[PDB]
Amino acid sequence: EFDTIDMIRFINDRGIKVLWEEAYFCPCLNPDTGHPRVDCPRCHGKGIAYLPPKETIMAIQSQEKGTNQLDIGILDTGTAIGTTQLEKRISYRDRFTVPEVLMPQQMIYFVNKDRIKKGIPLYYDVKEITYIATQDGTVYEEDYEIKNNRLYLNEKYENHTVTLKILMTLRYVVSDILKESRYNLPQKLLLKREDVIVLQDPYKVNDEEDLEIQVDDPKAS
Amino acid sequence: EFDTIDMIRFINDRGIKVLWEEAYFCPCLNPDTGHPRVDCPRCHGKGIAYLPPKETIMAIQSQEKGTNQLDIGILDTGTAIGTTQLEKRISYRDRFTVPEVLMPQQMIYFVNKDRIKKGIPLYYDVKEITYIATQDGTVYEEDYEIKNNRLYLNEKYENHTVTLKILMTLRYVVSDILKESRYNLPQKLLLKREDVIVLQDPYKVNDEEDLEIQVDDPKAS
Amino acid sequence: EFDTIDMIRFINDRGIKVLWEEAYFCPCLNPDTGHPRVDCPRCHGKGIAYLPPKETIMAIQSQEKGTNQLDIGILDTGTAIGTTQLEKRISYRDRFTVPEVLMPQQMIYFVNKDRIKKGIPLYYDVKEITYIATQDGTVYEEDYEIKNNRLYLNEKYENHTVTLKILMTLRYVVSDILKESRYNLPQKLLLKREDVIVLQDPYKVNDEEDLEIQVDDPKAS
Amino acid sequence: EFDTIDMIRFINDRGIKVLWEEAYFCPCLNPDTGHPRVDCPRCHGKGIAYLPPKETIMAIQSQEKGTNQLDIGILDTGTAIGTTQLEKRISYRDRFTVPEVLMPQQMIYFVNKDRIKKGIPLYYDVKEITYIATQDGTVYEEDYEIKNNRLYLNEKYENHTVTLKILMTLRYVVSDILKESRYNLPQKLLLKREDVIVLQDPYKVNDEEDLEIQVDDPKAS
Amino acid sequence: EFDTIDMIRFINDRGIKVLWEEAYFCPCLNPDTGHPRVDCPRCHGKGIAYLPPKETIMAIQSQEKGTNQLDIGILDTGTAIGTTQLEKRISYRDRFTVPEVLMPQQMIYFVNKDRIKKGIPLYYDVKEITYIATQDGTVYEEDYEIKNNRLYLNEKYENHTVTLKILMTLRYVVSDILKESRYNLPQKLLLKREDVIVLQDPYKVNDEEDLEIQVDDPKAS
Amino acid sequence: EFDTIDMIRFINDRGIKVLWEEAYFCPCLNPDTGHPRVDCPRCHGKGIAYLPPKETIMAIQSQEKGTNQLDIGILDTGTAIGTTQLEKRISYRDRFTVPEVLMPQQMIYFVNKDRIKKGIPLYYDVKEITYIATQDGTVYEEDYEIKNNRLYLNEKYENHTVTLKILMTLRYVVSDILKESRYNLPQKLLLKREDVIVLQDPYKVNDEEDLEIQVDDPKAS
Ligand SMILES: [Zn+2]
Ligand SMILES: [Zn+2]
């Protein structure tokens, strides 16, 4: 139990405020295809849903003796190790939010009549639009809105391409539990940063495979 | 024998109470296909069966000089090293239970008439249902039961999708024997955590390949 | 916050002057193909465009404890780690320029009537032509010009092959964000040197796959 | 020669009693197919035969400076390093027996009329049957026997599936010679534990590919 | 700048005399195929040509902290790290010659009428023929000559096979630039030894794929 | 030159007597196929021939700082590092013999009328037959002979399978030159032990692919 108290101290000394969302598989699936519902309000079409968030403190690291002090985030994009205490057993797929850290992302879409009507889901917890434009130039604020993490564009932008740069909250999902037998005892987790899991809606939809942008993207895979 | 006494001390100093189940290949196999019987009470269709459990003490580690102090659980999901003493030779496929550690899991199923009748096998040693729902909302306790590690749902949930989150006992199966010539002498084992071996019954059955959920799962493979 | 002040000092002690360009996906894409416009002035056909540059100071390294002091540039051609402070969140795809460092490159093209008319895009920030020739010998200065980072040749060089050696500004694009939770706080970036991303226009165009030079190139891939 | 005397001391200090069998390729091969004879008494159908055993002392390790003190048995299932002195040159394929170490194994077979008549070869040096059963339950001792390392079942078990758990002598075969120029001088060998080479006879024979059990086996490959 | 002066001292302390040839892509390419001209005097058919050599001093290493003191030449045949000072920016594909080091090579060819007439290009900077023969025995000096790094054989050797062993100057080509931002400032280069890039002309030509010798070659690939 | 004198001392201190054979590609090749002549006396059908042997002293190691003190022979079967001094440049494919070290090997063949007549080439420098037999038992000495490293069997063994165990001289061939610029200066070589290159003649010949023995061989590949 001397190793436990050291770990609790580490969490307290180096931990940052996070939110924890308990995950489950969303039961909206289409029995015929196995696919989530496109516009499911629980999972937004991704097939994993979450229970209400709860606060905790979590130390996040990318290097430790267990990795030979190598940076696991360099070895594998978007990987980190989290250590936390919580009243409940943390599970695979659960999601952690670091409210005070804003991360960037860029995305681009062909705006059809459906996208005008239903809006374009962004999937992230969008906090700011840092840039937005079409081929015609800057999209002014009166011509769009962000609601329920969806981009709603003015109908004049039908059949245009919209490009977007955002700030969103830093989030991770649990890929694994570590040291499951060692040791509110500490729980140690392998984390995956959200931007390495989330796939933007496709550039253009086919009624047949959807069309992705034909652009060399240097973002690490 | 000085290396032996050090190892016995380690087991005693750092070992936790576990149960050991001697494994054998289940003889329920269908001679025509080589597949276990779906609802075999010995192996539950997985083709490996176990003799009655026996208690011991086992030190469990994910790092040692033999791994360069690298975390083998990070290198390979669900891998650990166990060290124990026992009157009998421990073998590949044998199963260890850590009664005092509860692990999580999530699973999802399309509930057909067969599943109502026979129940849905969960495979784990289920200790608690932390969440259960269909597309219609929460499944109340009077509408289900867990018996012999199977989910029995009320017949009104036929043709629904049920999603489930559980707590189960931590268990490992032996993938290998290590240091077989060195050294109740210590036995050293490569372990595989259960959740990395167990495959849930498929989302939906075809009368043809079964249909799995079309969901990106971040659980480490 | 003691780790933060050390990092700020490192940037200040070892940082060099750089320019930062905020990147976004260029909305010139052809809705039918997903390809950028060949001669788009924003992205030059590469599908990523940039906002006006801003100055900062960035420490650039190829070795650190996080890599076991291994040279990541040897492990992976054109990879480096950058550390900088900036008022805005740096993102994937953003581009850094090191104005005071000139890098080399060589390229070769079959000069058709289109290339005479529109010029040949070089993609780099070209600062000098160190060598230029055809099969007929040296191309004298009155017979070419570099405008908007394009090679414009005199029309007599139609149906010739031109070879070119240049100096260009050293530039990187961001492939990843590192230590996203640690810590104008320092921002730590995985960088990709430009010459490992940029693809020269093809040797010869087909009206069908374009024809690349059939030459064994020792440049690291 | 100072490195030699150190090595001889190591063998003497840390060596255990082993038997050595000189191996050769068995000349029972069918000229038409290149396959050994199924029931060859020399090689039992495996195509390698052995001369009479001779005693020696061999130090067996899974970690050394030559492996960076990494456990080669974890890196590669069933691998070890042996060091011994012997009057003859030890070769690839030769087999070492550690009489005082018993190892486990499990196997399963469909019992046809041939298997009743000829018995089922187990391939290992079987010392004990720890468990034996069919779908009908425990096979009592009067209903079987182990002779010449074959399982002979009572004819009533025709068309049954028999499952078996055993103890056998620990054995290795030489995969390589190491330090062939350094240095009865010490001989250093890369060893392969028997259970990682031996393939049990197939579950069921086809008159066409034989049918193996359709069971997920966690034994390391 | 204290790291710079250390690097300059290393070059001076451990550097050897080398020649540097600035490389460019040869514009002899056939527009139809993308292949260099077989007997181009600039590139000899390899598609890379060089400007006149210039002398410098270069430290050459196969081990450094950046490789964990591992021998990169063992990790990857023909790889080394060069450090040098020069008035011009050294580029990918440029070639370094170490005049005072002679390296070996062996090659073999079927001598057709073309090869008698045009000679057989050897590609290396040939300094000596250490052995030369056909199936008929030793080729005496009056029956051959080396001119412009080509083997010219007496016409009596038409339809013979000639085998050749040579000494040539040690040469490298630049595969990469390292530490491009650090720091006549030092330039640090990843080098590729010539014999790992140069491909001998084929054993026999087909008018269809050319025929290479069907011989197991232990030269590292 | 202080690093040179240390290396010369190492060779002298730790070197063993070896023979060196200068290698060249054998010009017996069939112009039509590119294959050596089956019974060429120079290369025995392997396509590499050797000039008369010369004595030297060579230090042979499987571990050095350049390998992180890892055993390259474990990393890659039959690999070693040799260091020697010689008046001539040692080359790829050249062969080293360690006369005072005898190595083992086993081989097996179907004896047709050709093999009786021409003998079976063993390829190694055979020093002793430790075991020889057919399906009929031991082959007595009056019924065979080893001449020019070929097995000549009495004609009564036509249409038999012969199995053979031998002792042969330890030999290596050069796969690479290391430290080509550093530094009778020392020459440092990557070596490949002969038994990892030599392929025995096939079990049985087809007039179509030859038939190899269908036996699981544990010799490291
Ligand atoms: Zn849903
Ligand atoms: Zn069963």
Ligand SMILES: [Zn+2]
């Ligand atoms: Zn554009």
Ligand SMILES: [Zn+2]
């Ligand atoms: Zn046999």
Ligand SMILES: [Zn+2]
């Ligand atoms: Zn040319």
Ligand SMILES: [Zn+2]
């Ligand atoms: Zn020959």
